Design a protein around this ligand. Structure first.
Ligand code: HEM
Ligand code: HEM
Lengths: 434, 434
């Protein structure tokens, strides 16, 4: 409660904080809705408090660019300090200043266009497993829970790309467990009581069950791995989360959009049959040829950017684009709110892949649309992820069409907790094109 | 208990730590004796743990110089992080990296030879008050408790030099209280439980009774003050501690040595009567003329360096003079042990002012003898303090001689707690020279 006057003092509007809690009660509508309501009432810049942590929200593209790009190494180097992290402090997305640079450099080649082309033949093999497992639930006629099949796929791909362990997760429900081993109760407390984090740290009770962590090095025998003692595995733990949840979630969002916009699904499928003809197998070169696929993926990432917020800690008193940022304030770029802002988007709530057509993509600001972040600390896996999703999308759409059920939640609702994911799992009728 | 193998791993000998406690139980003989025993058994370099804080002790002059002087701004910038500090974080002796530099620069002029000469007439006036208050207890014939009279003097000088408030503390026992408002119970706990410091911080219960702290700004009306909102007073809080305790303590040590070495007391007094004749008043120029006075003060500071230890935190993994210092280890220079080391001192336990005679002072290593520290972060008040003590010594010795009582503790013993001070207060017969 020592900072609660900070935004008053700076002239920065925002919701009035409560002692100890700050504004965290406002989150009862979800992170994303809080951000949108705040943008609506307060304007371009506002401040609020996560417990006692002042957070400054910025929506001006120039200032976003200054924060993510220009003044990154100097001022905005790290994300918000989190609670019990333990050895996971060595994670590339957790490391701060030095060590990060090291990890980042030590890993940037592992995500070069070169390795991806080398991995495209590999991950394509789980597309077929996916098609067959799809054709199984399809022939039954019963609705399909996309998260389950896509999850199995995503898990299959990340395990092979990161270790070479080739498994059929959906058909081998038993590495499968260990990874599958995965709301906001203690977390809230850790926010209001950040002073208990060091206690939690010394008890060796990090957030993860750190018993599969032994399993990982116990399974690190001596792909992402061959492209390289305990910190080594800490990076791969981050890769699995990315490769599994975010990928499968985004895949479910896209299929939801495709099933609810048949014309879009048909056009995409026409693009996939023009390219890649006769259910031909997708390659690295072929994917980068499919323009409408890129627009569909991009639109969906506009509607549903699974990171929701971009965040950087101000390391020193600075003044950027005419406003003073005191040391220690977290600067938040509310990507979700920005993706749905009518200032930058006509009918922001409408799915409209044409926004991203070669004509219209120009009039789109790269600091307003930030599905993968920006500047030095952006998503190192963006290319890998897009390819992985596109490859999935192509093979599935080469063989199946997707339709709403009685069971499908329309309009989809977002989950109320702290992850960008559907309220109800996406469930769709799947019909074979043959 | 996560670092307890660190010195094993580095090849660095030391006392075996205990989980959670480290080696703090070894302190039962006092900081200083622990350091001496360790130096005796382990050699030039050893390591130990204050709870979980690894501390590396170095005794090689070259490496000390590298730590205090060469690699200060780069590696060894700050002292050990302490427990609940609160606003007192703004203190020059607590501030770290930046802010320190600022304070240090913002205060270095306040301790220039120039202001001291301006303050010498001022502080000389409390020498006379001291003489008279001395002549009072003297005429009674009863033994004198040097800490009480010297304390009143030290308090009188620091209050006038830092604010201009001229008071007769000994004769006005009622600012007097507020400052006078001044063992190791919770402290030990805070060492073994550093994880509770942030708790203690958020409760606004800093170590000081922070009610006289209001009094200070309530008495900061708008000397050290005129040579210049809340941090301003935080520096003056540090000045009072220095001006009061350390000065009065060192004065008591010196008088103890003088009373126990009559020949030394007589020689000094001959030097004061040769200079400054006929109980003439001491001036800035006169003081710097008295060579034997400088040797007596210096010898006593060898025997009793009230800081006992010098300490710097290693900010980054470095390798100095052929040994690797991991980040976060406190590097400790055990001044007390070094001042009493037979490698550098003949008969180190003997009081021998001649060690510091113009002939012998040359063969004395400035990194072995560090009563005021060294390099950028040394005692900013060294000159002020020496002048203050010397002025006191001169006026007192111009009028009185000092002798042991039945009541005097001979040989003096050092207090067992964490301050360098006598076990029993020094008590001496005081006889008037007239
Ligand atoms: C649809 C899939 C994904 C999306 C939308 C996504 C989005 C993001 C975003 C918005 C950030 C933060 C950027 C910033 O701070 O400016 C990020 C960071 C990161 N992502 Fe992804 N991501 C995805 C998948 C992946 C994948 C597949 C990988 C690796 C295999 C990955 C690895 C990382 C890493 C390591 C970081 C932290 C970068 C750093 O700390 O320097 N992500 N991602
Ligand atoms: C006999 C009297 C004194 C002795 C023996 C003494 C000794 C020391 C020592 C050993 C240090 C640490 C040096 C290092 O870290 O290398 C120190 C620091 C310091 N002393 Fe003194 N001191 C005395 C009196 C004073 C006085 C009278 C003042 C001011 C009026 C003062 C102000 C300071 C300050 C501000 C620091 C911290 C410097 C910094 O953080 O940059 N001291 N002193």
């Amino acid at each position: 409660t020592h900072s609660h006057g900070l935004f008053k003092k700076l002239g920065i509007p925002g919701p009035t904080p409560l002692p100890f809690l700050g504004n965290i009660l406002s989150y009862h509508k979800g992170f994303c809705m809080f951000d949108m309501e705040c943008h609506k009432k307060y304007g371009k810049v506002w401040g609020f408090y996560d417990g006692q942590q002042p957070v400054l929200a910025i929506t001006d593209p120039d200032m976003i660019k200054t924060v993510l790009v220009k003044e990154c190494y100097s001022v905005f180097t790290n994300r918000r300090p989190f609670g019990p992290v333990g050895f996971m402090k060595s994670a590339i997305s957790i490391a701060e200043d030095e060590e990060w640079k090291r990890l980042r450099s030590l890993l940037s080649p592992t995500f070069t266009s070169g390795k991806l082309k080398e991995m495209v033949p590999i991950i394509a093999q789980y597309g077929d497993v996916l098609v067959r497992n799809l054709r199984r639930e399809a022939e039954t006629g019963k609705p399909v829970t996309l998260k389950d099949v896509f999850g199995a796929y995503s898990m299959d791909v990340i395990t092979s790309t990161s270790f070479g362990v080739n498994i059929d997760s959906l058909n081998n429900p038993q590495f499968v467990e260990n990874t599958k081993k995965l709301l906001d109760p203690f977390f809230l407390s850790i926010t209001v009581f950040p002073f208990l984090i060091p206690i939690l740290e010394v008890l060796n009770i990090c957030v993860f069950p750190r018993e599969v962590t032994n399993f990982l090095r116990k399974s690190v025998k001596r792909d992402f791995l061959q492209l390289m003692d305990l910190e080594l595995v800490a990076q791969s733990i981050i890769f699995i989360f990315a490769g599994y949840e975010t990928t499968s979630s985004v895949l479910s969002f896209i299929m939801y959009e495709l099933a609810t916009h048949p014309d879009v699904q048909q056009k995409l499928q026409e693009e996939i049959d023009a390219v890649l003809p006769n259910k031909a197998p997708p390659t690295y070169d072929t994917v980068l040829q499919m323009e409408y696929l890129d627009m569909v993926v991009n639109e969906t990432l506009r509607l549903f950017p699974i990171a929701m917020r971009l965040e950087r800690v101000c390391k020193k008193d600075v003044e950027i684009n005419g406003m003073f940022i005191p040391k220690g304030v977290v600067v938040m770029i509310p990507s979700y709110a920005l993706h749905r802002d009518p200032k930058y988007w006509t009918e922001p709530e409408k799915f409209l892949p044409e926004r991203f057509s070669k004509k219209n993509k120009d009039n789109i600001d790269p600091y307003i649309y930030t599905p993968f972040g920006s500047g030095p600390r952006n998503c190192i896996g963006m290319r890998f992820a897009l390819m992985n999703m596109k490859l999935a999308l192509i093979r599935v759409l080469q063989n199946f069409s997707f339709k709403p059920c009685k069971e499908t939640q329309i309009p989809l609702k977002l989950s109320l907790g702290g992850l960008l994911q559907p309220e109800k799992p996406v469930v769709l009728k799947v019909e074979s094109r043959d």
